[PDB]
Design a protein around this nucleic acid. Structure first.
Ligand SMILES: [Mg+2]
Ligand SMILES: [Zn+2]
Lengths: 86, 100, 90, 298, 18, 110, 201, 95, 330
RNA sequence: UCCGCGGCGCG
């Protein structure tokens, strides 16, 4: 599976390649509605969905969809473990 | 919404839900073991989606709770014994049940 | 039941390879298993292998040769079955 | 932000069991070993069986020699107490009782105590003898205690051997022990370190959020911690597979234990190692600051 | 590559990565 | 004795008016009381007492066969003018020593 | 940016709580309570238990005591596997209810499954190689761990209230490691020097 | 063993509750007193003497007593075919 | 008044799919039964519930029998002298009438009682389209996996289940495939009523005679008898309707245009049909193809035929596994 | 409870 661990400096290009979006707001979480809004420390498009196989706006709810992007909230549909990777 | 301290809990049997009083507070002086329910508590789930079962049952029943999550405690595993005394504290401006 | 391992250590001229060979033998015994070579004492397959090693009939050189023999026989049986299936329609 | 709070109390009549901890008053610790039936205890000539059998070999090493003298003095304390119970059992008259108490209080050297039951009462003396049936109490200020002569005189006042050592009889054999054994009345305690507040196990339960390990503590079904030095202890040994499974399958990898728990039910006993997610999380924190890090190839 | 795994580790080193 | 039925009590750890000592002390004192059973196996006793003063086992309402051997064993202490207690005591014979924890093994009537 | 990357290095710009130096991405790796020594070398494990020590003279030195409760809680996956094969139940929920009801038909099964299944034992201050051993357990009523006396010399463990933890190996490789090396009978000379360890104490 | 046995040879010494009770313990309401209490039936066994078909001896019971009549059947002693001898049934004998 | 039964009956996305009175007939009775179960009295309850104006109530049945069945509200000949001689065994008249029962506990037990009631209500409409055609072209897409069978989360407001001998044994109706056949017996399966797709029986294998040939469905080709294996091979007598023409390419398609399309939805196998003609001798010789005919003969004095063919290159004419001659007699 | 600090106590 693996043979070596290589460590070196990170270019801005590599940082941009890693980043799936950007964060411009100091918002943490919306109140009176415990759901995240657009770009911030938490988000939906930037880091992925909250509920597994469930978009933020509830547009598509079934397990067969993979990689589809909604227009109200642009997110993919996969289990929430992606929040640990993106 | 605020939680309820009703004596109704879904997906449980009356064999465990026999010692508990209708007011939602266990009888004074009743031997209990691990896993038994002492006080029944449920929380407003929030609908956010109307299933066909919720479409049918809510209107006919007349009660629109209509299926909420439970938050009742239970005796921690390992400890048992008797319930010598129960205390009830309620804030002002809110009605009190018969037990208080 | 077994209390020591010293007999198996005396048989196979190392102690670390004993764990590997006995693990392979016992795993073969448990999943996809065949008959043991010693009349069992209603014990688990973990200890059955160690009884066989100290009995001086199972080791790494015996086990891998038996595995090669059985896989060669199974491949020959596969070829024979393929030929028989081909000749069935003929 | 809370509507109303309700509280309940639970009463547990927790009794004694193996695995507790009792001690005297001289640091002689102990953990209860096994509760035996009454007959198996060593019993003296008058049938009365002992209740605690301590190990004397902890005496000369820990050097706490005071507990032996405490035992000897306490044994004499019941000697007056038992005899008082003997006279009161057959309703002995007051003049035989009172005088006897005058003989117990006036022994020893010129102590500061000076008690005269000739001038209290009759009913009060009867009540005092009633309260002394379970054993005549003895006080001893710290650095002036009774020496060997005083306790010997107190022992002789009853009907007991002076040396304080009697002959016992084993319940299993019925054969006299060839050497005398020291018996007496010791004050013993009870400590809160109970066994049932410590014993807990865990097959599989909850899991933390930031990194996938079982929690800790008796509450919320924690799992015991494979210590850092236990890794070295296994490392010095030859068990590589044990350590691999210990820190890969049973603890961290989500795909590991989930697939392992499916195999463990169907008779299969094979692991499927992966990548510890705690190491993976760390990788992100290494990639987060300014430095690239990744696994090289296959 | 110290205890039992050393035999496995040697096999990977000699058969693979070569 | 195995079980008792103190009338106005709800649980083992509460108390009562007039009675000098606790219910726990009552049960600890009463567990040492000795009886004799000849004909039946699970006889039930009854105690009724009023007035002020000590209460012994001698006032136990006897039956056809139940015979007390120590009638001067104290149980409670009545101090108030009107604190009459009424208890029902269950006695069964057997062998060995049986703790109260094992008695809960039935799980049809308790 | 300085406070985010390494808090407390230059200005200690914390202002988290009332006099509380808050952590950082540098602090969450380094230190005693960082990431390495906290969750990468010594990692908490499943299939474990902890209880109090008790001496037992009636059992041989390659076998140790074990209470019913700890064994039944530890070997729950093993109980499910053996029970399903015998056909007492059909679904995992029925087997879980059977374990939760502790009927008489599970104690015999637990006796069958533990006949040749070694378990591990270690003290909390594991100091040298002999601080961890293995024993083939024998089910005994109680709430503590019965233990052979002589091996108590190896642990340097007295009986004033010391506590032990139990771990259970699962795979055939791990069990064979236990039986071949981890047992008490296989370690009768110290790694430090040739003197015995089963010396009468 | 026999020796020890010899040493101990001269030493060893080797029903229907309704039919047996009055009508005062029945589980019937007071509105149906005309059917049983006012029909010369002072015992529960007298009311239990009628079977599931013979219990129509008195039609004076009210409409609400019909549900109360079924409430007697919940005790498993009435409205099912019980037949007392005169007061008690055959299984309610106290011999 | 209830003031909500009318809204329930005129929701009407789910109410109008089934009969408009179904909710007031079956669901109301199920709710009454659940309320009676939640009640202490074990009495049969009949719900007189209508969605017209909210006049919904409950009644306690009498259960007039010769015993104490349903003893909470049982009736018998014990009231023969008081109920105008209404004694019988089997009558279920309404002895009493309940008023109302909110039954919040029954609202909790809804997941056990009313969930099954709603499942039965959905199954009532499911069976109206599962196999209501009593045998026709019914298709199905497989989306679920079931033990000892092949599941399919198909349409028609229901599921579908195929047995081992129902669909093609070589390729069952599993994830990544579809079926198309004929079925008429559809009972209530698990989780409501379900359809049935069996593309291996005669009703699907022999149905290709008018779905694959281009001149058979218009009654221009003799297609009246066809016996074939399930989803493996087919050997039927492709003949013309007394036209005395070459019909070998009629039912098998021109240049093999129907051999791979006769059972494309049933598994996609290859078939080898036999030919025929208007001459009885030629038809008898060619009906068992491949058969090496060596003589011509016919018997009519007895209920038997005469297969006069060789067996050297015609091992299927004598019959080794029922490949060519098995459908010849048909 | 699961996020963290501080205390007291056990070995
Ligand atoms: Mg210690
Ligand atoms: Zn969405």
């Amino acid at each position: 599976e693996f043979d070596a661990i290589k460590i070196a400096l990170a270019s801005p290009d590599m940082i941009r390649s890693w980043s799936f979006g950007e964060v411009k707001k100091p918002e943490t979480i919306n109140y009176r509605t415990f759901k995240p809004e657009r770009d911030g420390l938490f988000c939906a498009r930037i880091f992925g969905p909250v509920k597994d196989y469930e978009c933020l706006c509830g547009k598509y709810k079934r397990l067969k969809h993979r990689g589809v992007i909604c227009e109200k909230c642009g997110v993919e549909v996969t289990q929430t473990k992606v929040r640990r990777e993106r | 919404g605020p939680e309820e301290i009703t004596a109704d809990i879904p997906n449980v049997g009356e064999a465990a839900l026999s010692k508990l009083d209708e007011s939602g507070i266990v009888y004074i002086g009743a031997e209990v073991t691990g896993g038994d329910i002492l006080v029944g508590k449920v929380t407003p789930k929030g609908e956010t989606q109307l299933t066909p079962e919720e479409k049918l049952l809510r209107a006919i029943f007349g009660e629109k709770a209509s299926d909420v999550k439970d938050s009742s405690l239970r005796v921690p595993n390992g400890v048992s014994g008797t319930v010598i005394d129960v205390q009830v504290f309620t804030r002002d401006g809110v009605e009190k049940d018969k037990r208080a | 039941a077994r209390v020591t391992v010293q007999d198996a250590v005396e048989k196979i001229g190392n102690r670390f390879d004993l764990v590997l060979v006995a693990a392979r033998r016992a795993r073969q015994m448990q999943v996809g298993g065949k008959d043991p070579l010693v009349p069992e004492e209603n014990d688990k397959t973990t200890v059955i292998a160690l009884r066989e090693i100290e009995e001086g009939l199972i080791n790494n050189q015996i086990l891998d040769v038996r595995e090669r023999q059985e896989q060669q026989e199974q491949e020959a049986a596969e070829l024979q079955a393929v030929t028989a299936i081909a000749e069935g329609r003929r | 932000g809370v509507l109303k709070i309700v509280k309940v109390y639970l009463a547990v009549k927790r009794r004694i069991q193996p695995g507790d901890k009792m001690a005297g008053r001289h640091g002689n610790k102990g953990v209860i070993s096994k509760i035996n039936p009454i007959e198996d205890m060593p019993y003296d000539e008058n049938g009365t069986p002992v209740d605690i059998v301590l190990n004397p070999l902890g005496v000369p090493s820990r050097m706490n020699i005071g507990q032996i003298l405490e035992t000897h003095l306490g044994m004499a304390a019941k000697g007056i107490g038992d005899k008082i119970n003997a006279m009161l059992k057959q309703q002995q008259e007051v003049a035989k009782l009172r005088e006897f108490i005058q003989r117990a209080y006036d022994l020893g050297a010129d102590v500061r105590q000076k008690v005269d039951l000739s001038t209290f009462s009759d009913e009060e003396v009867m009540r005092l003898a009633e309260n002394l049936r379970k054993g005549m109490p003895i006080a001893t200020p710290v650095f002036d205690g009774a020496k060997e002569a005083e306790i010997k005189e107190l022992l002789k006042l009853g009907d007991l051997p002076t040396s304080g050592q009697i002959r016992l009889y084993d319940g299993r054999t019925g054969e006299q022990f060839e050497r005398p054994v020291t018996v007496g009345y010791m004050y013993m305690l009870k400590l809160n370190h109970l066994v049932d507040d410590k014993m807990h196990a865990r097959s599989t339960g909850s899991y933390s959020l930031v990194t996938q390990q079982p929690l800790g503590g008796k509450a919320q079904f924690g799992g015991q911690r494979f210590g850092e030095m236990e890794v070295w202890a296994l490392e010095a040994y030859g068990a590589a597979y044990t350590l691999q499974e210990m820190l890969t399958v049973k603890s961290d990898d989500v795909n590991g234990r989930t697939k392992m728990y499916k195999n463990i039910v169907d008779g299969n006993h094979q692991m499927e190692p992966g990548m510890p997610e705690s190491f993976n999380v760390l990788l992100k924190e290494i990639r987060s600051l300014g430095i690239n890090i990744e696994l090289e190839d296959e | 590559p110290a205890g039992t795994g050393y035999a496995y580790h040697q096999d990977r080193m000699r058969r693979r990565a070569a | 004795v195995t079980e008792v039925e103190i009338d106005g009590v709800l649980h083992e750890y509460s108390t009562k008016e007039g009675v000098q000592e606790d219910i726990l002390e009552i049960l600890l004192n009463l567990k040492g009381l000795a009886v004799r059973v000849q004909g039946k196996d699970e006889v039930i006793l009854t105690l009724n007492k009023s007035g002020i003063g000590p209460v012994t086992a001698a006032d136990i309402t006897h039956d056809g066969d139940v015979e007390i051997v120590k009638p001067q064993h104290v149980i409670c202490h009545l101090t108030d003018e009107n604190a009459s207690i009424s208890m029902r005591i269950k006695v069964q014979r057997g062998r060995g020593y049986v703790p109260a924890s094992t008695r809960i093994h039935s799980e049809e009537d308790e | 940016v300085d406070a985010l990357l390494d808090n407390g290095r230059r200005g200690r710009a914390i202002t988290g709580s009332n006099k509380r130096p808050l952590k950082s991405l540098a602090d969450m790796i380094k230190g005693k309570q960082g990431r390495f020594r906290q969750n990468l070398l010594g990692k908490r494990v499943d299939y474990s238990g902890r209880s109090v020590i008790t001496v037992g003279p009636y059992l041989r030195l390659h076998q140790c005591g074990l209470p019913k409760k700890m064994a039944l809680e530890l070997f729950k996956p093993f109980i499910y596997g053996k029970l399903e094969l015998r056909g007492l139940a059909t679904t995992i929920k029925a087997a879980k209810k059977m374990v939760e009801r502790e009927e008489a038909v599970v104690w015999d099964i637990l006796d069958e499954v533990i006949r040749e299944h070694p378990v591990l034992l270690n003290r909390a201050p594991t100091l040298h190689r002999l601080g961890i051993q293995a024993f083939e357990p024998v089910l005994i009523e109680g709430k503590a761990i019965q233990l052979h006396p002589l091996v108590c010399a190896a642990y340097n463990a007295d009986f004033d209230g010391d506590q032990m933890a139990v771990h259970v190996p699962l795979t055939l490789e791990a069990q064979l490691e236990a039986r071949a090396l981890m047992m008490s009978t296989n370690n009768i000379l110290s790694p430090a020097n040739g003197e015995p360890i089963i010396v009468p104490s | 063993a026999t020796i020890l046995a010899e040493q101990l040879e001269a030493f060893v010494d080797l029903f229907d509750p309704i039919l047996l009770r009055p009508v005062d313990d029945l589980e019937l309401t007071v509105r149906s007193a005309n059917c049983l209490k006012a029909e010369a039936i002072h015992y529960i066994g007298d009311l239990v003497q009628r079977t599931e078909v013979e219990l129509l001896k008195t039609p004076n019971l009210g409409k609400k007593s019909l549900t109360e009549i079924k409430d007697v059947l919940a005790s498993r002693g009435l409205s099912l075919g019980m037949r007392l001898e005169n007061w008690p049934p055959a299984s309610i004998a106290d011999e | 008044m209830n003031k909500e039964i009318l809204a329930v009956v005129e929701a009407v996305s789910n109410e109008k799919a089934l009969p408009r009175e179904k909710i007031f007939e079956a669901l109301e009775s199920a709710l009454a039964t659940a309320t009676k179960k939640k009640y202490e009295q074990e009495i049969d309850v009949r719900v007189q519930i209508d969605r017209k104006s909210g006049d919904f109530d409950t009644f306690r049945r009498w259960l007039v029998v010769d015993e104490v069945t349903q003893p909470t509200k049982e009736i018998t000949l014990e009231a023969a002298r008081y109920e105008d001689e209404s004694l019988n065994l089997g009558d279920y008249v309404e002895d009493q009438i309940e008023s109302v029962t909110f039954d919040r506990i029954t609202t909790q037990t809804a997941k056990q009682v009313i969930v099954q009631k709603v499942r039965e209500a959905e199954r009532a409409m499911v069976v109206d389209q599962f196999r209501e055609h009593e045998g026709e072209i019914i298709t199905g897409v497989v989306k679920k996996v079931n033990r000892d069978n092949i599941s399919l989360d198909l349409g028609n407001n229901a599921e579908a289940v195929i047995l081992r001998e129902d669909m093609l044994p070589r390729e069952n109706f599993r994830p990544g495939d579809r079926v198309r056949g004929v079925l008429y017996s559809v009972r209530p399966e698990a989780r409501g009523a379900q359809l049935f797709v069996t593309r291996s029986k005669p009703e699907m294998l022999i149905e290709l005679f008018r779905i694959e040939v281009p001149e058979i469905g218009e009654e221009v080709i003799e297609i009246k008898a066809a016996a074939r294996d399930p989803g493996s091979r087919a050997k039927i007598a492709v003949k013309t309707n007394d036209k005395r023409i070459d019909p070998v390419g009629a039912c098998v398609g021109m240049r093999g245009a129907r051999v791979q399309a006769v059972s494309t939805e049933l598994g996609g196998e290859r078939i080898d049909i036999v030919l025929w003609d208007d001459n009885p001798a030629q038809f008898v010789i060619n009906a068992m193809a491949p058969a090496d005919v060596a003589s011509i003969v016919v018997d009519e004095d007895k209920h038997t035929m005469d297969i006069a063919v060789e067996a050297g290159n015609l091992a299927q004419a004598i019959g080794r596994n029922g490949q060519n001659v098995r459908l010849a007699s048909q």
